[PDB]
Amino acid sequence: RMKQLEDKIEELLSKNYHLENEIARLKKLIGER
Amino acid sequence: RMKQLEDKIEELLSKNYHLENEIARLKKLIGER
């Protein structure tokens, strides 16, 4: 089912995006003392 | 085209797994920096 696969991709992209945001927060912190 | 979508999912899972490893590595580094 295509919508089911498309939903799964959408869910993984969303996770990916959230993971990148966490990485960006962690690197911001590393930039301070 | 379903195999194409299924491939994309495998590729996003792999990307996401690697981001989780990077997060783990960043948190360790912040704990020792």
mmCIF file with all atom_site columns, C-alpha atoms in Angstrom:
data_model
loop_
_atom_site.group_PDB
_atom_site.id
_atom_site.type_symbol
_atom_site.label_atom_id
_atom_site.label_alt_id
_atom_site.label_comp_id
_atom_site.label_asym_id
_atom_site.label_entity_id
_atom_site.label_seq_id
_atom_site.pdbx_PDB_ins_code
_atom_site.Cartn_x
_atom_site.Cartn_y
_atom_site.Cartn_z
_atom_site.occupancy
_atom_site.B_iso_or_equiv
_atom_site.pdbx_formal_charge
_atom_site.auth_seq_id
_atom_site.auth_comp_id
_atom_site.auth_asym_id
_atom_site.auth_atom_id
_atom_site.pdbx_PDB_model_num
ATOM 1  C CA . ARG A 1 1  ? 0.000  0.000  0.000  1.00 0.00 ? 1  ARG A CA 1
ATOM 2  C CA . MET A 1 2  ? 1.461  3.286  -1.200 1.00 0.00 ? 2  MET A CA 1
ATOM 3  C CA . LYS A 1 3  ? -0.065 5.752  1.266  1.00 0.00 ? 3  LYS A CA 1
ATOM 4  C CA . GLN A 1 4  ? 1.116  3.396  4.033  1.00 0.00 ? 4  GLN A CA 1
ATOM 5  C CA . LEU A 1 5  ? 4.680  3.484  2.642  1.00 0.00 ? 5  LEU A CA 1
ATOM 6  C CA . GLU A 1 6  ? 4.422  7.241  2.040  1.00 0.00 ? 6  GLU A CA 1
ATOM 7  C CA . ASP A 1 7  ? 3.274  7.689  5.666  1.00 0.00 ? 7  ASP A CA 1
ATOM 8  C CA . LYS A 1 8  ? 6.296  5.671  6.884  1.00 0.00 ? 8  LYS A CA 1
ATOM 9  C CA . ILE A 1 9  ? 8.695  7.827  4.826  1.00 0.00 ? 9  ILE A CA 1
ATOM 10 C CA . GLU A 1 10 ? 6.993  10.970 6.185  1.00 0.00 ? 10 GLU A CA 1
ATOM 11 C CA . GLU A 1 11 ? 7.438  9.629  9.723  1.00 0.00 ? 11 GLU A CA 1
ATOM 12 C CA . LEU A 1 12 ? 11.112 8.845  9.151  1.00 0.00 ? 12 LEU A CA 1
ATOM 13 C CA . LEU A 1 13 ? 11.780 12.270 7.590  1.00 0.00 ? 13 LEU A CA 1
ATOM 14 C CA . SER A 1 14 ? 10.144 13.890 10.594 1.00 0.00 ? 14 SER A CA 1
ATOM 15 C CA . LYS A 1 15 ? 12.319 11.795 12.954 1.00 0.00 ? 15 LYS A CA 1
ATOM 16 C CA . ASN A 1 16 ? 15.384 12.658 10.902 1.00 0.00 ? 16 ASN A CA 1
ATOM 17 C CA . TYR A 1 17 ? 14.546 16.363 11.214 1.00 0.00 ? 17 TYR A CA 1
ATOM 18 C CA . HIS A 1 18 ? 14.101 16.103 14.978 1.00 0.00 ? 18 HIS A CA 1
ATOM 19 C CA . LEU A 1 19 ? 17.397 14.239 15.259 1.00 0.00 ? 19 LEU A CA 1
ATOM 20 C CA . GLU A 1 20 ? 19.203 16.953 13.309 1.00 0.00 ? 20 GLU A CA 1
ATOM 21 C CA . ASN A 1 21 ? 17.676 19.559 15.659 1.00 0.00 ? 21 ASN A CA 1
ATOM 22 C CA . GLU A 1 22 ? 18.969 17.645 18.715 1.00 0.00 ? 22 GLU A CA 1
ATOM 23 C CA . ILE A 1 23 ? 22.424 17.427 17.154 1.00 0.00 ? 23 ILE A CA 1
ATOM 24 C CA . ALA A 1 24 ? 22.285 21.201 16.464 1.00 0.00 ? 24 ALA A CA 1
ATOM 25 C CA . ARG A 1 25 ? 21.379 21.836 20.194 1.00 0.00 ? 25 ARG A CA 1
ATOM 26 C CA . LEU A 1 26 ? 24.199 19.563 21.357 1.00 0.00 ? 26 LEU A CA 1
ATOM 27 C CA . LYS A 1 27 ? 26.740 21.345 19.051 1.00 0.00 ? 27 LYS A CA 1
ATOM 28 C CA . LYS A 1 28 ? 25.521 24.806 20.233 1.00 0.00 ? 28 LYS A CA 1
ATOM 29 C CA . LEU A 1 29 ? 26.263 23.695 23.770 1.00 0.00 ? 29 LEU A CA 1
ATOM 30 C CA . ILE A 1 30 ? 29.778 22.471 22.723 1.00 0.00 ? 30 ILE A CA 1
ATOM 31 C CA . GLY A 1 31 ? 30.403 25.981 21.329 1.00 0.00 ? 31 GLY A CA 1
ATOM 32 C CA . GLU A 1 32 ? 30.103 27.485 24.847 1.00 0.00 ? 32 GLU A CA 1
ATOM 33 C CA . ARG A 1 33 ? 32.653 27.110 27.711 1.00 0.00 ? 33 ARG A CA 1
ATOM 34 C CA . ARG B 1 1  ? 7.854  1.817  -7.488 1.00 0.00 ? 1  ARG B CA 1
ATOM 35 C CA . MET B 1 2  ? 6.830  0.072  -4.214 1.00 0.00 ? 2  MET B CA 1
ATOM 36 C CA . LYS B 1 3  ? 10.343 -1.425 -4.109 1.00 0.00 ? 3  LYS B CA 1
ATOM 37 C CA . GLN B 1 4  ? 11.551 2.158  -4.736 1.00 0.00 ? 4  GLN B CA 1
ATOM 38 C CA . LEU B 1 5  ? 9.594  3.381  -1.689 1.00 0.00 ? 5  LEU B CA 1
ATOM 39 C CA . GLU B 1 6  ? 10.756 0.393  0.324  1.00 0.00 ? 6  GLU B CA 1
ATOM 40 C CA . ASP B 1 7  ? 14.371 1.207  -0.629 1.00 0.00 ? 7  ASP B CA 1
ATOM 41 C CA . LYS B 1 8  ? 13.857 4.846  0.498  1.00 0.00 ? 8  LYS B CA 1
ATOM 42 C CA . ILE B 1 9  ? 12.626 3.657  3.891  1.00 0.00 ? 9  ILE B CA 1
ATOM 43 C CA . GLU B 1 10 ? 15.746 1.474  4.315  1.00 0.00 ? 10 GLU B CA 1
ATOM 44 C CA . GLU B 1 11 ? 17.902 4.460  3.433  1.00 0.00 ? 11 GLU B CA 1
ATOM 45 C CA . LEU B 1 12 ? 16.130 6.753  5.949  1.00 0.00 ? 12 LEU B CA 1
ATOM 46 C CA . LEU B 1 13 ? 16.359 4.107  8.707  1.00 0.00 ? 13 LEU B CA 1
ATOM 47 C CA . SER B 1 14 ? 20.074 3.845  8.082  1.00 0.00 ? 14 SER B CA 1
ATOM 48 C CA . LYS B 1 15 ? 20.516 7.674  8.111  1.00 0.00 ? 15 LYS B CA 1
ATOM 49 C CA . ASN B 1 16 ? 18.478 7.949  11.297 1.00 0.00 ? 16 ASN B CA 1
ATOM 50 C CA . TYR B 1 17 ? 20.489 5.174  12.994 1.00 0.00 ? 17 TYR B CA 1
ATOM 51 C CA . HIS B 1 18 ? 23.681 7.053  12.178 1.00 0.00 ? 18 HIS B CA 1
ATOM 52 C CA . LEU B 1 19 ? 22.256 10.286 13.619 1.00 0.00 ? 19 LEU B CA 1
ATOM 53 C CA . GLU B 1 20 ? 21.384 8.461  16.844 1.00 0.00 ? 20 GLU B CA 1
ATOM 54 C CA . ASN B 1 21 ? 25.028 7.301  17.051 1.00 0.00 ? 21 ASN B CA 1
ATOM 55 C CA . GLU B 1 22 ? 26.261 10.837 16.517 1.00 0.00 ? 22 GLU B CA 1
ATOM 56 C CA . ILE B 1 23 ? 23.976 12.146 19.278 1.00 0.00 ? 23 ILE B CA 1
ATOM 57 C CA . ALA B 1 24 ? 25.339 9.472  21.607 1.00 0.00 ? 24 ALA B CA 1
ATOM 58 C CA . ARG B 1 25 ? 28.912 10.452 20.669 1.00 0.00 ? 25 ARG B CA 1
ATOM 59 C CA . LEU B 1 26 ? 28.173 14.176 21.178 1.00 0.00 ? 26 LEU B CA 1
ATOM 60 C CA . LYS B 1 27 ? 26.716 13.536 24.621 1.00 0.00 ? 27 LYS B CA 1
ATOM 61 C CA . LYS B 1 28 ? 29.804 11.489 25.604 1.00 0.00 ? 28 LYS B CA 1
ATOM 62 C CA . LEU B 1 29 ? 32.119 14.242 24.374 1.00 0.00 ? 29 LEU B CA 1
ATOM 63 C CA . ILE B 1 30 ? 30.172 16.912 26.372 1.00 0.00 ? 30 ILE B CA 1
ATOM 64 C CA . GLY B 1 31 ? 30.687 14.639 29.414 1.00 0.00 ? 31 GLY B CA 1
ATOM 65 C CA . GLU B 1 32 ? 34.472 14.747 28.971 1.00 0.00 ? 32 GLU B CA 1
ATOM 66 C CA . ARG B 1 33 ? 35.256 17.955 27.132 1.00 0.00 ? 33 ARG B CA 1
#
